Each structure stands twice: as C-alpha cells, then as structure tokens.
C-alpha cells in the first residue's frame, strides 16, 4: 500500500472511530485485556487528576492476573500522575 | 573433548587442601561439573576411614551391610560400594564411581548451565527471607496432593521448556521442586499468598480454620536435578560411559542396591544398570519414603552434611519404628 | 609496521592504495551459537539471553558488534594516505547504537558490514581518526559502530584532513520582521517558495559541516547544509528551506556562530533534578588475554607479546579496551536493564587509561538523565589506585509502558494549576487554549478552572463581541431525527439581537459537561507535554484513554489536532451532550445513568446474567436502557437510559438479592427458556411502580447500584445515534489528512468502540461496521483494490 493511501484510511477510520465512540458502549474491560495480557505492560501511567482507571487496573490485576503475575513473575507498577509524581519523573527523596 | 570450557578455574584439588588461599570462591566450588564428583570422592574417603579404622578390608564392610543406597547422585557411590572385594581392586571401583559423577557433572552443566538472576528478584527474595533462587525449592510441611496443585497453577501459563516439577519426594510432608530458577521464583510468589505469618498465633480459632503454616527455601545446588530439563544429557552420559569402559555388571554388585524410584533392587533389571542410575538422577523423582522400605536395626550416613545431612531426614521418617541412623562422616 | 598489522587483522591481498574518503565493505558473516558461546565466555556476560535454551532464539549481544565489524571499522585506518606508527596507535572510543526500530542480532542472521572514516585531523599531539560502521541484515540497518583511533606524533599532513561534524539543532523564533530580514540577507538561507511568510513561525536548523584543512587554523574549505524546518500548529516539523553555504580558506562557519547567537540549541538529554545510585560492581581482568584475541580477531601483539608490549613502551601485556567495554556493559545490562538484552539500545566506552591483567575494577552507575524515553545512565571504572580507567553512558529503554488517560467525573477547581506556575511546556498549552476561547467564544477556561463561577455572562458589544457572536449562532446540531435529518441550532436565544448570553450551573461551571470536557482534556495534555519536555515517553508506548479520554490521548501520542482544534471539538461535544436530550420543565432530563456493583447482588452474578437482565427490562417495557461502560469484570459496570427504566433495574437487583435467587440454580439447570415468565412477572410489578410518579424522578440507590449524580444525558448508547452524523462532520473540519501520522496509531492505540489495538487493514475495517453499519467504511470494504495506487 502507498503511505499517501494508507494515510487516507487511517483518517477515514479515525475520524468514524470518534464519530460512534460518543454512541456506542466505552469497552475497557476488553481494553485492559489487551494492555495487560497481549502487551505484558509493566508501567501503566494513568494521566488524570484523579486516580479512576488506576484502582480499576489494581481491580482488574487482583482478579484475573494474580496466577499470571506470580507465575512470569512479571512485577507490575501502576501509577497516577497525581499521586506518584515521583516514580514517574524518577525524582526520589534523599 | 570440550571438558576444558567447563573448568574455568581449573580442577586442582590436591593445590585447594593444601593452600586455602588459592582455592576458589564457594558458587565456583558448587558448580555441578566440580561439586558432583567431588561428593563422591568425600563419600568414598569417609567409608574408607570406617574400613580402615575397623581393619577391614572394603569387601569385609560391604559383606556386612544388609543393603546399600543413594539420595540423587548418592546412588553411583553405593552402587561402587556393592561392587568392592579387596583394597587393591577397590582403585577400579572408585574410577568407575568418579567417572560417572564427572560426565553427569560435565554433560549436565552443559545441557541446562546457571546464568545470571534479574537483581530485581535476589533482592525481592532476600527482603522475605526466602534464599537465593537456585534450581532445588524445598516445601516443608505441604502433602505431595497440596503442592501437586501449586505446580499445576504454576505450569498452566509457562510454556513447555521453563515448567517445573516435583523432584524429591523425601517425606510425607517434605517436597523439593525442580526447574528454572525464574520459574521457582514464580511458584514463591503464589505460596507467599497461601502462607501465614509465623508470628500469628490461631491458637484461639477452631482448628479446622486455621491457615497453613509452611517453610519454603531454595537449596544449594547450580542444576536442577531429577527434571526434564537435564533430559538432553540422559543419550550424551550413556555414550561417554561406553566411551570411558564403564559398566557395572549385576553378578559383581554382592549386595542389594536399592533404586531411588521404585525401591526395587537394580540386581533384577533387564538392561543396563549404567543406564538406570543416570535416568534415576537425570529424569526420574526420587521417592525416598519408599526406597528406604527395606527393614534394619542400624542406618549408616556416609554422605556429606552430617546433622544437615539426608541421615537425620531418614530418622525423622522412621522415628518411632526402631531404626537408629548413625551420622558416619 | 602495517604490512604485519595486516597480516594478523585483515583477510586481503596488501595493498594500502585506496582512498580513505571511499566506502569500506566487510564479508557477509554469520552469527551461529559456537561464536556467541565462545564470546560471552571471554567477557564474563552470563545473561540468559545469550544462552542456547529448549523452546527460544539465542540473542546475541551487541558488544559483539565490534566481532562482526572488525575487518572492516580498522581497515580505515590503514590507506597511506593516513600515515602512522600503528605500534603507537590508541584506541579512544567505541560506541554502538542501535537504529530506532531494527530487533536485536540473532543467532541465525547474516550480518553485511559497510565502514566509512568521518574525520581525519592532525591535532597538536597527533592525528585522530572517527570511523563509522553500519550492519545491515536483509538489506536494511540493525546498528551503527563509531570507533574513534588516535596515531600518537607530529603530523602535517593537512591535504589528507578532513571532518564531517553533525551540528546541535539550532531553534530561532521569528518575532519581528527584521528578524526575517537578517535572515533574508543571509545568501545561505534558501527557500523552497521564497514568498513563504515566516513571521511568528518557529524554525529548526538541522546541519552538518564538511571541512577540508589547510592548517590547524584555516580550512581550504567548508561546506554546511541540511534542511530548515518550521512547527507546525501540531508540533511536527516540516521541511522549508536548505542551507547552502560554501566557501574557500576560512577561519570558521559563520552559520554555526549566527544560530548560537540569535537562536538556542535544542539539547535531547534532559538530566534528573540529582542523579539515583544503581551499583558499585567489581570486575576482574583475566590474567591472559589470548582468550578475548581468538573470538574478535583483534591479534594486536602488545595484548599477548612482552617483547612488542616493551617495544612499544607500555607497562607489559595490557588488556584490550574492547573486553573493558564489553565486560562493564555485562554489568550495565544485568543491574540498569535487570538483564534484559533488548532494552539496553545505545552504549558508548571512552578509554581514559590502561589496565594489566589481574587489575580489580569498581564501576560507579548512575541514571543521570532521560532521552526519548530511554534512561540515560554514566558509568566511570575505577583500578585499585582509585584511577579513573572506562567512562561512558548507555541509553537504556524504560520498561513497556501504557498511558491511559481519565475521562469526566474526576474534575476540581484548581486542576492541574500547580503544573502550570511550574511548567513551561503546560503554561504553552492552557495560554495556547485560553487564548483560542477568550477570541472565539468569550470566555477563559483558566478563570473556569482556576475560580469555579456559579453564572458566567459573555457580552457580544463592540465589533470583536459580533464576531464572537456569530460564533455561537453558526454552532447547530445536525440531529438524524425522523426519516429527514432535522438541524436543532445550539443556543436558540442567541440571534441578531442579543448583547449578552448567561451559562447557569447550581454548584459551579466546571461541573457543567461544555466546561469540564476541556478543563479535563488541557490538564492531562499539559500533564503529558510536561513528561514529554523531561523525555519521559517512550517511543513505542500503548495509549487508550475511557471516553473523553480518547481526546486527550490521541491529542498527546499522536498529535493528530493542534491544541486549538482539541479545545472545539470537545467544546462542541460537551454541547452536543445538553441540546441531545429533551428537558421542558428546565434542565431536568428523564433520563440518567446508575453504576452497578454484580458481586453484591450475588456471587454467582456476573456477565451474560446482566446483560439479559437489562436487555429484558427494555424488550419488555419498550424503554431505552443500555450497559454503556464495561470497567471491570464482575465489579463495575455503567448502565444509563430511560430514568423509568433504570428505576426497575435498581428495583429489580435489590429483589433478586433479598429474594436471594441463584440464577444459574434457576437459569437452565430447573427450567429452560420459562425464566423469561419468571423475570416479566419481577419486572411488570417494579415496571408500573415506577410509572407513576415525579415526572423527572428522584432515583435511589440500592445494594447492587448507585446512581452518577448530575449525569443526565445516556451517553455512549444507540438514544444519540441519531446526533452522529453532524459531528462526524464536524470532526473532518478539525482533524486533517496531513496531520495523521498512521505511524504513531498503528499496534499503541486501543479505541473505546473496538477494544482492539487500531491497525489499518481490511479485517479491522470488517469488525467497525459490524458495530457501526456506516457507509463510508462499507464503500472502502466493496473496492479494498485501492491498494492499487
């Protein structure tokens, strides 16, 4: 496929991904899945002034990737920009 | 051939007794290649001590052992023990004992060698007072049916190659489980879940509900013995033995030796003898409870440990059946 | 000197007659597990990667590089042209990097090497040759090798010099216009359209400069080039304009001294506020050097030989600087990577000393700085008498890493406003964004956040007051309502006549929809360009944000919108979410959402239970009720519709826990398809209990559910279908073609509508009409032969 074509597309797609999303049911459990499991995402940064879709990450692991943790022992950090600066910026105190 | 690679700070023993100055750092001297022969050779020196010191020849000891066997590798040492008459054939027992520990050592490094542990997890592990991973886990005080369903967890989401399994069966509630230091590692993480706390005190809650209370502790090994990663070594040992003129016939072995799978005596068996004694420390588990089924007044300890050592463990399964152990070394 | 060098290093016929500004090409070689055995054995690297294991693909590490491109990196500084005492040569520096992108060697590649020399100076003390390799596996670049050599004595030999420097990214913004004059005068400064307007732009100079010598001092030539870029409105660069500058005999680049006066560079590493301690490791030296001499070919005599050690004048047999390197970065890769192979991704060695075998070496770690998104971490090696030995730093990639981004509800006054008295890449993105709406719509969204006013007046006096005006009368609602689609123009009190327009909350504006959709969007967009400015983001993140979120995300990782455009359409969605529901009486709506907690209905009740339950509730009383956030499994659910309908389900939930009925108990295992009675007759009692009262109905909460407070719009349902295609519209208007780098979506962005990692392929394009039925998508699916050009 030409870039300029494929360009064409991606905009079609997204701008009609935007379009429904809006009209059309917010899908995360079957996101969480997909950043959790099929990417084996270690660090997951929620950007947000509150800590919402951290907790419902902490609930999604403490779930159905307790086993999966321990046995890849695949240690995992989930952070909020509001309340672990920090870990983010790796500026530890003294 | 390529035994030199292995050796990296050679093998000069007789230099290491006398200097310990130039002997090495402890992780080098465990390396199976080093540490399995060298077992073997501390088991024979310690029987022969017992022989000379009682004035008997090693055929004279043997003739008055009812039966002889091994925990893992332990079962070359024996097997060599049943085979010895006189102490001028006892030299061509002893090259055939430390032969086969050193192709076990040498073939078996090769076929699953240690490397290094993400820093992230030795310090995990060191903040819970669990050891240093190694490939030998020990689970005190969990029946072989709660711990057959831990490994189960475990191995359903690792893939064929890095799986673990039991490996020694030494008690009723005493499992050793054998793999990847990686994956050990991950079957710790889902006991720390099930255990409780030492200090909880339940002496106050009815019985039946109570938390399991459990040791679990990595062992002092460099290979994960009795598991199906060493398989690849089984074919290699078998030929560098037939290579080196190493057999042991059933007609020369004077006593029966009793083999760490079953507890059936290798005087019976078909095949090789050779061949068994490498599966029975290469693949197959090691159920000590039924090997040590024989009955006898009097169990001596040759091997290495001593109050540590696989003696007292066998005191601890037969207390009470009128059975001493005697801790020779 | 050289005739033996060559002997013991290259495989060739002896011949030095070959120009050093020509391409030097290596053999094809092939990596096999014997090598990287026999390799990592010599340096001490016993990480798992690099080890043959049942069930995987033995890596090999990139230290062995240097292995591979040996033959070709020294032959570089054979020619006669570059003449030296190869006796007194010193190695100074070796670096590897990796290209952004290309996996890490295998064992069964077949790895081409092509070297080029960069640089060859006579300084005062001797002459210095940069050489850089490249290996290339299926004809494409894996790594880039830069060694740099040092031929100790007294060279003037200038006609044979030469020095490709690559120039820090030069940054001027255009203010004025004689800022664009000085500029125009310059003979350098082309244009690709000369006509091109260059006031309030921001240009980038990104340059190279080519320099033959004629003495230490004065080059017989310089040459610097390389393409002008301008910031778009997205923050992509563009190419404008080249620089052109030659010249003959010259005491300096006046184009390099023009841009660090009037511009500023654009430095990539960004240091931590203080540096974090890693480790202080011991390493030995091995007591022999014929070990490291077999595997990479390096048969220099002075690593092996006393007699040539002596002869050349060093303190005996010394180590070779390549094992130092290699053996450090064995530690680099197991404490800083935690034995990762593939993360460690640039690694560069200066060699400050010489070390004798049975030497015992302490290295220093250190995180020091961020770059891209890898950790970038300086080492120094130190000897027994405490002398400094290797230096270097490695780029270290930050584990794999998801940015997920919060949508409504989490709002406060004060959001994010600690950011911006800090930050200046936030303080671009509020001012960027109050700037748009004070000009356009009145009003500043800092003053919003900052002081949540319960009312807010715009004023439409004077000409700039028309024009904000005319600004709100042209916002409509394209709405799909009945079988023609019926235009429902925003703001029905606004026309011709009007001085002032009031927005009215209860509480304050902030928790108004219009308002709180940017206010969130700007706070985590500043947020995330604040990382961004510290090189906090790796390249190949994931991002997903829930709902609006969506915005926020794909405005910050793939800079599809400029701020500008971002601000409107969520704007214009928070709006589009106040004219899609009817409310007569004032702004009471029939309509909410309740979020709902299966677990404490009953622990058997879970998926597939809820999504009858509701589906029924809905078939049955013929009022629109929907599931609109799946959150978590069996722990949170979101469901929103009719306010009626919603009030049976609360209802209905909080009978089945008292009742205290097992629905599997009852599902199929007693009675099979019959439920549908059992259910109806739960409904129709709750059904016409909740159909007759309070008109827009005060809705209580329950065991099982909790009502979302000030949430009257059923958002992300089929009721606002039917307002889609308005802003589908809408969107083509402020979301561009060019401003789409496919790149920067493809296998990271996880949609909301298709929980699926957005590519662009037939089958993704197949799975959104399946949940969409729209007809620009199906047209594409019927001609997917626009492959085809």
């Given at each position: 496929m030409k870039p300029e074509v494929e360009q064409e597309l991606a905009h079609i797609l997204l701008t009609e991904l935007l379009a429904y999303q809006f009209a059309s049911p917010v899908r995360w459990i079957e996101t969480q899945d997909v950043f959790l499991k099929d990417?084996?995402?270690?660090?997951?940064?929620?950007?947000?002034?509150?800590?919402?879709?951290?907790?419902?990450?902490?609930?999604?692991?403490?779930?159905?990737?307790?086993?999966?943790?321990?046995?890849?022992?695949?240690?995992?950090?989930?952070?909020?920009?509001?309340?672990?600066?920090?870990?983010?910026?790796?500026?530890?105190?003294p | 051939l390529d035994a030199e690679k292995v050796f990296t700070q050679g093998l000069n023993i007789l230099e290491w007794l006398e200097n310990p100055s130039n002997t090495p750092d402890k992780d080098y001297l465990l390396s199976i290649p080093i540490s399995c022969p060298l077992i073997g050779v501390i088991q024979?020196?310690?029987?022969?001590?017992?022989?000379?010191?009682?004035?008997?020849?090693?055929?004279?000891?043997?003739?008055?052992?009812?039966?002889?066997?091994?925990?893992?590798?332990?079962?070359?040492?024996?097997?060599?023990?049943?085979?010895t008459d006189s102490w001028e054939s006892f030299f061509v027992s002893v090259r055939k004992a430390i032969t086969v520990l050193f192709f076990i050592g040498v073939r078996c490094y090769e076929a699953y060698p240690n490397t290094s542990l993400p820093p992230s997890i030795l310090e995990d592990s060191l903040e819970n007072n669990e050891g240093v991973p190694s490939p030998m886990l020990s689970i005190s005080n969990l029946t072989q049916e709660q711990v057959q369903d831990y490994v189960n967890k475990t191995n359903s989401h690792l893939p064929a190659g890095k799986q673990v399994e039991i490996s020694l069966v030494n008690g009723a509630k005493n499992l050793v489980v054998s793999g990847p230091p990686q994956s050990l590692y991950g079957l710790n993480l889902t006991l720390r879940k099930a255990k409780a706390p030492s200090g909880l005190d339940q002496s106050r809650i009815p019985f039946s509900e109570r938390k399991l209370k459990f040791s679990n502790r990595f062992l002092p090994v460099a290979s994960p013995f009795h598991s199906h990663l060493l398989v690849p070594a089984s074919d290699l040992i078998n030929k560098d033995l037939v290579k080196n003129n190493v057999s042991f016939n059933a007609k020369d072995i004077q006593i029966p030796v009793y083999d760490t799978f079953d507890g059936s005596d290798l005087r019976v068996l078909s095949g090789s003898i050779s061949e068994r004694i490498v599966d029975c420390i290469i693949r197959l588990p090691v159920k000590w409870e039924t090997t040590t089924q024989f009955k006898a007044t009097h169990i001596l300890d040759f091997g290495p440990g001593g109050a540590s050592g696989l003696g007292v463990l066998t005191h601890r399964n037969k207390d009470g059946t009128g059975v001493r152990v005697i801790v020779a070394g | 000197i050289k005739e033996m060098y060559w002997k013991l290093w290259i495989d060739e016929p002896f011949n030095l007659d070959f120009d050093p500004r020509d391409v030097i090409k290596g053999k094809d070689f092939e990596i096999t597990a014997k090598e990287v055995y026999d390799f990592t054995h010599a340096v001490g690297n016993n990480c798992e990667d690099f080890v043959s294991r049942p069930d995987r693909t033995m890596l090999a590490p990139m230290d062995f590089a240097i292995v591979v491109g040996w033959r070709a990196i020294i032959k570089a500084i054979f020619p006669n042209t570059v003449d030296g005492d190869l006796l007194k040569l010193v190695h100074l520096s070796n670096?590897?990097?990796?290209?952004?992108?290309?996996?890490?060697?295998?064992?069964?590649?077949?790895?081409?090497?092509?070297?080029?020399?960069?640089?060859?100076?006579?300084?005062?003390?001797?002459?210095?040759?940069?050489?850089?390799?490249?290996?290339?596996?299926?004809?494409?670049?894996?790594?880039?090798?830069?060694?740099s050599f040092f031929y100790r004595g007294n060279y003037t030999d200038f006609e044979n010099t030469f020095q490709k420097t690559v120039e820090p990214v030069y940054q001027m913004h255009i203010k004025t216009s004689k800022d664009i004059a000085v500029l125009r005068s310059k003979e350098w400064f082309q244009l690709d359209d000369e006509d091109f307007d260059l006031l309030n732009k921001t240009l980038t100079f990104e340059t190279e400069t080519e320099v033959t010598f004629k003495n230490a001092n004065i080059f017989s030539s310089v040459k610097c080039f390389g393409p002008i870029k301008v910031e778009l409105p997205t923050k992509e660069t563009v190419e404008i304009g080249i620089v052109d500058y030659e010249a003959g005999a010259s005491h300096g680049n006046p184009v390099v001294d023009f841009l660090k006066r009037n511009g500023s560079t654009l430095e990539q590493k960004v240091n931590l506020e203080n540096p974090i301690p890693i480790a202080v490791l011991d390493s030995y030296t091995p007591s022999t050097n014929e070990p490291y001499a077999r595997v990479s070919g390096d048969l220099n005599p002075i690593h092996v030989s006393r007699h040539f050690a002596s002869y050349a004048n060093l303190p005996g047999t010394i180590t070779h600087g390549m094992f130092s390197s290699a053996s450090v970065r064995a530690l680099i890769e197991n404490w800083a990577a935690d034995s990762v192979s593939s993360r460690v991704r640039g690694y560069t060695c200066q060699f400050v000393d010489m070390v004798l075998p049975n030497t015992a070496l302490k290295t220093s770690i250190q995180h020091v700085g961020m770059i891209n998104?890898?950790?970038?971490?300086?080492?120094?090696?130190?000897?027994?008498?405490?002398?400094?030995?290797?230096?270097?730093?490695?780029?270290?990639?930050?584990?794999?890493?998801?940015?997920?981004?919060?949508?409504?509800?989490?709002?406060?006054?004060?959001?994010?406003?600690?950011?911006?008295?800090?930050?200046?890449?936030?303080?671009?993105?509020?001012?960027?964004?109050?700037?748009?709406?004070?000009?356009?719509?009145?009003?500043?969204?800092?003053?919003?956040?900052?002081?949540?006013?319960?009312?807010?007046?715009?004023?439409?006096?004077?000409?700039?007051?028309?024009?904000?005006?005319?600004?709100?009368?042209?916002?409509?609602?394209?709405?799909?309502?009945?079988?023609?689609?019926?235009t429902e123009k925003i703001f029905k009190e606004i026309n011709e006549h009007s001085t002032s327009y009031t927005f009215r909350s209860e509480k304050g504006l902030l928790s108004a929809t219009q308002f709180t959709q940017p206010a969130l969007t700007l706070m985590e967009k500043a947020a995330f360009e604040d990382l961004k400015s510290k090189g906090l983001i790796p390249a190949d993140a994931t991002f997903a944000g829930h709902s609006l979120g969506e915005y926020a995300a794909l405005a910050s990782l793939a800079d599809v919108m400029s701020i500008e455009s971002l601000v409107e359409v969520v704007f214009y969605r928070g709006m589009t979410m106040q004219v899609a529901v009817p409310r007569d009486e004032l702004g009471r709506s029939?309509?909410?959402?309740?979020?709902?907690?299966?677990?404490?209905?009953?622990?058997?009740?879970?998926?597939?239970?809820?999504?009858?339950?509701?589906?029924?509730?809905?078939?049955?009383?013929?009022?629109?009720?929907?599931?609109?956030?799946?959150?978590?499994?069996?722990?949170?659910?979101?469901?929103?519709?009719?306010?009626?309908?919603?009030?049976?389900?609360?209802?209905?939930?909080n009978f089945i826990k008292l009742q205290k009925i097992d629905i599997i108990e009852l599902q199929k295992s007693l009675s099979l398809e019959e439920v549908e009675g059992h259910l109806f007759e739960i409904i129709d009692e709750a059904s016409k209990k909740s159909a007759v009262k309070p008109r827009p109905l005060k809705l209580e909460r329950g065991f099982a559910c909790i009502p979302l407070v000030g949430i009257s719009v059923p958002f992300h349902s089929t009721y606002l279908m039917n307002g889609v295609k308005p802003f589908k519209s809408f969107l083509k208007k402020n979301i561009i073609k060019e401003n789409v780098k496919v790149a920067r979506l493809a296998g990271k962005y996880i949609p909301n509508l298709t929980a699926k990692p957005f590519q662009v392929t037939k089958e993704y394009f197949q799975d959104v009409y399946d949940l969409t039925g729209s007809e620009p998508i199906k047209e594409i699916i019927d001609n997917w032969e626009k492959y085809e050009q």
């Open positions: 990417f084996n995402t270690e660090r997951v940064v929620e950007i947000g002034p509150s800590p919402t879709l951290a907790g419902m990450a902490q609930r999604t692991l403490k779930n159905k990737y307790e086993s999966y943790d321990a046995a890849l022992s695949l240690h995992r950090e989930i952070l909020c920009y509001s309340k672990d600066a920090k870990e983010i910026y790796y500026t530890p105190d | 024979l020196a310690h029987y022969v001590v017992t022989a000379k010191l009682l004035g008997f020849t090693p055929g004279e000891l043997r003739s008055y052992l009812k039966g002889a066997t091994g925990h893992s590798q332990g079962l070359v040492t024996a097997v060599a023990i049943a085979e | 670096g590897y990097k990796m290209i952004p992108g290309a996996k890490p060697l295998q064992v069964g590649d077949v790895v081409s090497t092509t070297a080029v020399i960069e640089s060859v100076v006579n300084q005062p003390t001797g002459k210095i040759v940069d050489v850089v390799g490249t290996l290339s596996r299926n004809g494409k670049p894996v790594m880039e090798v830069t060694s998104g890898r950790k970038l971490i300086k080492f120094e090696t130190r000897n027994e008498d405490d002398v400094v030995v290797l230096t270097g730093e490695a780029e270290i990639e930050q584990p794999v890493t998801t940015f997920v981004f919060t949508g409504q509800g989490s709002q406060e006054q004060g959001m994010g406003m600690d950011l911006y008295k800090t930050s200046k890449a936030a303080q671009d993105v509020w001012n960027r964004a109050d700037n748009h709406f004070k000009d356009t719509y009145g009003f500043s969204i800092l003053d919003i956040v900052i002081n949540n006013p319960v009312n807010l007046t715009i004023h439409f006096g004077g000409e700039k007051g028309k024009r904000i005006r005319e600004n709100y009368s042209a916002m409509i609602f394209e709405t799909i309502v009945d079988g023609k689609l019926k029939n309509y909410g959402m309740i979020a709902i907690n299966p677990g404490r209905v009953a622990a058997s009740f879970s998926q597939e239970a809820l999504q009858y339950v509701v589906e029924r509730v809905g078939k049955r009383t013929g009022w629109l009720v929907e599931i609109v956030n799946y959150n978590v499994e069996n722990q949170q659910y979101v469901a929103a519709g009719d306010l009626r309908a919603l009030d049976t389900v609360t209802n209905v939930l």
